[PDB]
Design a protein around this ligand. Sequence first.
Ligand SMILES: [Zn+2]
Lengths: 136, 97, 454, 126, 177, 123
Amino acid sequence: THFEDRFDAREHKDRSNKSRMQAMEEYIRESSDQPDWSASIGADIVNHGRGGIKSLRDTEKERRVTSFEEDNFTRLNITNKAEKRKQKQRERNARMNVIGGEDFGIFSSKRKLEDSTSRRGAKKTRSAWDRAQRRL
Amino acid sequence: SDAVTIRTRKVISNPLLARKQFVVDVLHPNRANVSKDELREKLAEVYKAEKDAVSVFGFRTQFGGGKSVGFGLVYNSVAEAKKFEPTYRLVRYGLAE
Amino acid sequence: ADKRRRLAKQYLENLKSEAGDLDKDIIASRLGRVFRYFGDKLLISEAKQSFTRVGENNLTCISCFQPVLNKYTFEESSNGDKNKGRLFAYTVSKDLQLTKYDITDFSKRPKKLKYAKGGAKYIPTSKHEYENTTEGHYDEILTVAASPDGKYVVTGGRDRKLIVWSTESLSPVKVIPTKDRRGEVLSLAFRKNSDQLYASCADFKIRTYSINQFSQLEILYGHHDIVEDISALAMERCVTVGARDRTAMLWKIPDETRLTFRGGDEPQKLLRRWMKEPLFFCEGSIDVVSMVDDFHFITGSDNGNICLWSLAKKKPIFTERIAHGILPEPSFNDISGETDEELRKRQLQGKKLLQPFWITSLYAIPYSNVFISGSWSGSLKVWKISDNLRSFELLGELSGAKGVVTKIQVVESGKHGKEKFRILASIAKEHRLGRWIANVSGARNGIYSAVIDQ
Amino acid sequence: QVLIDTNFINFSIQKKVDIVRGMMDCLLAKCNPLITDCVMAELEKLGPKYRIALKLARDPRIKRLSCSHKGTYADDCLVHRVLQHKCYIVATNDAGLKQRIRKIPGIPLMSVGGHAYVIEKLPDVF
Amino acid sequence: KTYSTPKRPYESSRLDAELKLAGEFGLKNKKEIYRISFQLSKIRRAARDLLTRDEKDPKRLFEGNALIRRLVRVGVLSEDKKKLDYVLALKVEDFLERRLQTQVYKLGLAKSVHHARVLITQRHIAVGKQIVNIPSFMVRLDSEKHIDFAPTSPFGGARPGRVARRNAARKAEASGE
Amino acid sequence: APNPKAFPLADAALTQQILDVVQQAANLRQLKKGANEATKTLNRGISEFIIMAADCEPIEILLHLPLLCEDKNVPYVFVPSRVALGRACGVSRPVIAASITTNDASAIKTQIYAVKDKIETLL
Ligand SMILES: [Zn+2]
């Protein structure tokens, strides 16, 4: 016959941070009840209060870039186009969504949660014996 | 009075080139950004080392004071220190011309 | 809500379906738990119990320097050649006096080696709150700890000054003002085999220093109410408990990050389980704490509750109710001031006005399965933990003490096989902080000692 | 708490806006819609063409507050209520009543217009 | 935009309402009032569309839980009032309460709201660890118990300020000369 | 057989709620603490509500306060334990009756109003 048999780089790549759906992530944190590793107040606030506290995402992103330094042992620099773009966007969304350290653009957005759940979603239950097997 | 604190965080080691690796925070309340030369000597006694072989660099100070972000090394031989350092750092330490 | 848990499981499998190791390991090459289980070898019923009273009143702590030899230095981790590996007890008194005892011999009652009492001339000539460098204490010393490297010993309490003392001269070797009006030092701890000092302070702060250079390292913030008690271990951490907020919070010092553990159970909920089957109380205020390993710790509240906590969960893994018991019940003649006995009973009003004993202090030797609690029941209660680390049990009692227990320390002795443990507790008439305890008798302010072997 | 008028019911059925829903959309709050007893009189008189506007004014989510006035004039029932109490929002669309309540101070007035409802004298509109 | 002009900006009701708000909270602009009310409109609009989404819908379930819990972590909502009709019931004055300069005045570190304004901009008030100096910080719960004076502030800390020290030296010169 | 005169006490849940709010009032100077301080405040008229211990020896010396409270419609609640009230008020000694006073420059206003309703349902 004929086919390709090539490295599925895109399939061996990850999309979990793409499909993360933060409100129900927050819920599953509440349910799975492990304590949170939150920081103290001075570790929170940004720049003599000129900006907000920080977002929880921004805490995560700082922790990860600090990990890039932790292992990789090098920093970023003042590269013009990219960080100007990202810094502007993140600060604009800071001044338009986050209030006191938590964000509400998550509700002003338009990404649904049924496109994540989808009544079991992937490898879904579409036959009655599949219903029987999942119920047992 | 002043808790002369540079936390040499991100602590790792490399004995191929024989040098030790560590990041910098600077916690130093009521002090104005301690300088790398007295840091060099202070690192020299704490690591029982050479005044050239100590090598830290690139310090940025955090808000709220008594906190600075930098990026530091130490060699473990005089030959390694005198050959493997780039010359801009050699003149920052005043060892080259 | 079963729909909700269904969808949560659905997302769990969904993200599992959507979802260098040897490199990290080889770099790591290029760079704990509970390990004792001797909580059965004790011979509690035949323990030696002894008492001493001290001329001052209201002692509050003890600091037995236990010199542990290093494997990098077999001889002594203690500096001098005249200390010779003895054991020292440091006791603070609301008489504003520190007293140094030798307790090195388990046959003899502990012996006062030295003392230092501060009167009132150590108040500052100025109310400036900044310059506070009078070398002696001047109010209500409340907590003490000594250096594990035998170098210094430091006290701190309501006069907002952390004063550290020489171990030999007993001179005030350094003074540290807290630089606040509300900076009352409440609890002290050392990093084990280190010089780092952890200070719980009731302006919601946890301050940390290096003592051998007298240097204010780093500051922590975060409770709802006063940061009451603290304790450390080998790791660069601490655990602390806030009093009137029901939160015990664990601090990773260098990463500057915290974990919060609450309570959450209920007298009504215990009513419900007994319906599915007495008297229940309310989770009032988290007071005493000690951490037993790097993964579990134990805290005692005001309503008698003793709680075993694991860092894995957030809720307590093992609650224990009124364990030191129910207080002396109010007498009818003094409740009423009126003759009739039945009216006096009606004023006493049955089960409601009862009160539980507190949990005034609690201590565990590290990495063991044993911990000691103390109330003013006049009875130390010694507890042993099951090796699954999901429950403990009352091992037994030591009633050789009486009155309000305040501070509990242990001293190990003997070699690896055979070990003899002395329990040393300070007992005052009152609580550490206020008065709050109404006419218990039979107590003398001083030290209680017990010695058990094997 | 909103005092509905006969006009409002008729225009709402014309412009196909839900009463409680569209009203609660426009406020962005929670609202109790009240038909006064004399307003249901005017609907019932107006009669056999508006059997539908009646039959839809009698929803179970439209509470009824009565009235003690010998007569049937909804407009006077409403203005006397409002001139006393000043805890209400008056939903109407008549021109004469609109100018009466615009001279009264402190009483939000509410109209239907175009697609959905609009508010005038609440500052708390967004 | 980050501020939106209210659609009937000059009205008897609007106008006297803003007068009361700015006078009582010590603001200085319609712009400050507008910023708060615009973001409240977005929140409350989200909650209303959530109410349109029917009972026991998974989206309504999870996101309503999210919105309630994050508003109580911000603190404008209270612990025992966990429902979406209460997130509908909020209004502007609750956020304007949670500002920082109101919070310094309410705790009691100053006397009047304008005093608290001048303190915070004067760099004396220190939430948590840093010196905050923006009078619209929107303090949360944990910090609203942690507001107090900065340790280098001469009200709760180090040596007196420059007017005091020039004056003490001036009377020192008075006694000297 | 009938209700004793200590009625009403509070459950443990109301107890911890009230001790919580009275602590935070003592932090912020809305608390007048002690018997005749509560009395002077109930004569001035400026007190939100009254917290009376019921452990006291005897009951009577503070039992005089329900008269003034019911004279002025100001609610009162017995907590069980007087050293728990000393606990909450943060002074060093058993306080048999404290009184939370009225104010508006108050970081704890709505917390107080919630507990005031909880009392007035309990009556
Ligand atoms: Zn009518």
